[PDB]
Amino acid sequence: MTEYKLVVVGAGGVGKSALTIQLIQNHFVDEYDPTIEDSYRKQVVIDGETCLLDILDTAGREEYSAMRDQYMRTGEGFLCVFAINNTKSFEDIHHYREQIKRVKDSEDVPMVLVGNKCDLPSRTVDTKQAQDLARSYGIPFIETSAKTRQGVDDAFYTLVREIRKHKE
Ligand SMILES: Nc1nc2c(ncn2[C@@H]2O[C@H](COP(=O)(O)OP(=O)(O)NP(=O)(O)O)[C@@H](O)[C@H]2O)c(=O)[nH]1
Numbered sequence: 001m002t003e004y005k006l007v008v009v010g011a012g013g014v015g016k017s018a019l020t021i022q023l024i025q026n027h028f029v030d031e032y033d034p035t036i037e038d039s040y041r042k043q044v045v046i047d048g049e050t051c052l053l054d055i056l057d058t059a060g061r062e063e064y065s066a067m068r069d070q071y072m073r074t075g076e077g078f079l080c081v082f083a084i085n086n087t088k089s090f091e092d093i094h095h096y097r098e099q100i101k102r103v104k105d106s107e108d109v110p111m112v113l114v115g116n117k118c119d120l121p122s123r124t125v126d127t128k129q130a131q132d133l134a135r136s137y138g139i140p141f142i143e144t145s146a147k148t149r150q151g152v153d154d155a156f157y158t159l160v161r162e163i164r165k166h167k168e
């Protein structure tokens with residue numbers, strides 16, 4: 001059983017914790033309880049293999065930015081999450097990707113672009129915008145809803161596959 005060190009990143013309130021708690025506990029956290037940092041562990045089957053997911057749920061609040069360097073060193077793949085109704089969180093992705101490449105000293109780091117809250121009406125970030133960003137970064141782009149569970153498994157399983165190829 002291969003362990004995978006996933007890190008969920010993104011601006012405050014985009015749904016990083018809700019996506020994680022949905023994946024591992026199958027329930028939707030309705031209240032906004034801002035994260036500092038929490039670790040989770042979930043065993044799954046992806047492409048006929050048993051793997052353990054080591055998931056770090058990080059803080060979007062800028063006040064805790066001093067924790068980023070340490071978790072970008074140890075993590076192996078990054079779920080970069082924005083909310084489809086938060087233009088700033090989409091723009092923040094550039095800044096996360098840059099800091100990750102800096103700390104990894106590499107232009108090829110496993111990551112997946114996640115546009116969350118797709119259950120909502122009147123998104124301010126259209127799909128075409130996010131596709132072009134992800135294509136330019138050379139990473140997958142998956143639309144999710146932590147509330148309905150749409151795309152949650154797909155987002156985490158795709159990141160596992162990205163880490164799988166980088167190691168091999
Ligand atoms: N409608 C909708 N609401 C969502 C979705 N995901 C999260 N939310 C809601 O948005 C709020 C923030 O979610 P949360 O997961 O705590 O965000 P976070 O990115 O972990 N915030 P922090 O960086 O402060 O921990 C909560 O009220 C939550 O219920 C989603 O897919 N759809």
Ligand SMILES: [Mg+2]
Pocket residue numbers: 016017018033034035057058059060
């Ligand atoms: Mg959180």
